[model samples]
Target chain A: LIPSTNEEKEADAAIKYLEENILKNSKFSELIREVRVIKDEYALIKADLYDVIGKINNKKTSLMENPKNNRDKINKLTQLLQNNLKIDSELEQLINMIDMAENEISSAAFFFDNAQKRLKESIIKRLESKNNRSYALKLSRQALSDARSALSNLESFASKRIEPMVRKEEIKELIKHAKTVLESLNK
Target chain B: LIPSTNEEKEADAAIKYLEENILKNSKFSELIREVRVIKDEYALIKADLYDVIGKINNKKTSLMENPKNNRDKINKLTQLLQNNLKIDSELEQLINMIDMAENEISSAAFFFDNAQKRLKESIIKRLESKNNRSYALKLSRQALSDARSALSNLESFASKRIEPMVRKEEIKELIKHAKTVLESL
Candidate 1:
């Protein structure tokens, strides 16, 4: 028999839809944003992670220290723990993608640096001797171009690779529908 | 005259080694372990990241609020920020390797799940039809094997791809050397 209460039905529908659709897809853009923000601030990010771990541990200790009358605090702490576990998973994926892009970029940067060094040391320095200077410069330029192309290819591949893997739009729709269902239940 | 303080010397050598060698290799094993631990607990891992972000924000607010005689706290906070920035770059590479492996694993899992579902339904229905049952079972098993092989190949690829990227042992040596220098100083 269907639940007589409207809220129960709404909750059931929302939960079902979320489980069937929303739960499967990670927030793809959010992960991208995460990497972008922390891309240059890993030390701060590490410290921040460490700090958070400390805070959670401290809270746990506090709760254990005073077993007296903090029911609400205990409940909140429990919820936070559960919530934290969920966030860590998403960040893990985000970090992974960010790492991939960073690797490609680093390789490109390294190639450019070496080419620049060679151009300055070998080609430009020997500019007075017109025989080999022009030829050397041309070769260095081509090498730089090849490095640039490699980096571009990797960047394009990463973007294409990630775009299809997670269905962000579909998940957003599912979530919106779930929220709407939830609101109607409250109403 | 050279500064004769032990702490000062230790600090200088620690900084020097860390700057020269310790920072280059991005703690490859640490990243691998991080992904390995949360391989099955993606939600938990995501949640932990969010929790950390929230904590940092909260700390920022707290520090900003009481702007009276907390100089030490402020200095430490600044150092933490700088250190975190350094760590983030190293982590970026690690995360990339992990994502490659995870992507392959997820694909394999999807294939396995689909094949498993088909096999279950087909085999259950063919109780009366032994001919079809054997044929269907064989096909399903083959599908499972293919899925397994695909996942295995990806795993092998991931391992091979990441192995040469970061010298784990070298990093360890550098860190160890840094520590000894730190101790001597």
Candidate 2:
């Protein structure tokens, strides 16, 4: 299952651990770098969407021009149409994956900031109670556990999800246009 | 005249006039309205541009399938090609008009701001010297005149100015694509 904000408090502790300077302990700094790269995968998804549109257009044009002798081309074209739907699903999941990664990162940081607010009670009490310091530090381990657990589901999320299909509808519309013209005579 | 900064300034004043809230004043407000409407006209330009590209494809499809009876379609296709150049020129001029209108309106407002700013100094100095009020008011009038002059040329600029061609070049590119496909057996 996809991760949720339920893990947010744990992330807050991790963020606290990080900001108190252990966050950059290479283990987490590397994660930040890794997370930064994930958002841009949407760029590749967009590029692929446009490429598939070109495929639909090019395939339709050739099919219209008649390739009855071109059996392999026909087969490939037919299969590509179905392949696009699979791509539509998979590429959309990548967004979920990337968004989750960002959420995990920011949630931890936000909660850490939330915990560290200049409120008098928190500052006075935490400063007074060595137990409060231990309690927050204890929560830090739980935060890391949740963060790692959320990251665990990511590979599959990067692989598939059911959601709104923008390119799916556009591809369908184009398929309609291509098929309509294809069914008609050249003139 | 090769049409220099006066036309440029016209755009300045027109753009200024845009900000000064004579917007519905019905004189140049209509002209300023013309510019705002001019920018949106690009939507229509793009709309027609795509429409013609379709026309190019569809017409070619027919011509590719044709014989002697297709004479009228052929004539229409050729006419459409030449017509595209005119649209390219005229549509680009629409942007020129919009930009010019905006500039003139801005020029007027900018001058007034500068004029008011100078007048701020004018009042400061005039409080010290009697002649400074006349000088301050004089400069504001001068600022208004230049700003108004800037607007004066904008009316001409929106209507006409020879500059670079954007749609023209794209249309030419498409023409090459169309003609190349056209010439081959």
Model 1 over residues A1-103: C-alpha lDDT tens digits?
A: 2322343333334333433553235332443444455544433443444455466656666556865666755765556555554544544554564576445
C-alpha RMSD between model 2 and the true structure: 50.7
What is the docking quality class of candidate 1?
Answer: incorrect
Q: What is the lDDT, from 0 to 100, of the residue A64 in candidate 1? A: 60
Model 1 spans with C-alpha error above 4 angstroms: A1-40, A69-73, A109-187, B1-185
Query: Across residues B37-139, which tens digit of lDDT does each residue of candidate 1 receive?
Result: 5443434433443444345445555776775655655555555445444444444444554566555434433433343333333333333234333443343
lDDT of 2 by residue, A1-187 (tens): 1111223233334334444554444443455465555446455544655555465657556454876566666655556556555655655565555555555554444433343332222223323344433443333333333333323332222222222122234333433443344334234
DockQ of each: 0.01, 0.00
TM-score of chain B of each: 0.29, 0.42
TM-score of 1: 0.20
Candidate 2 docks at the CAPRI level of incorrect
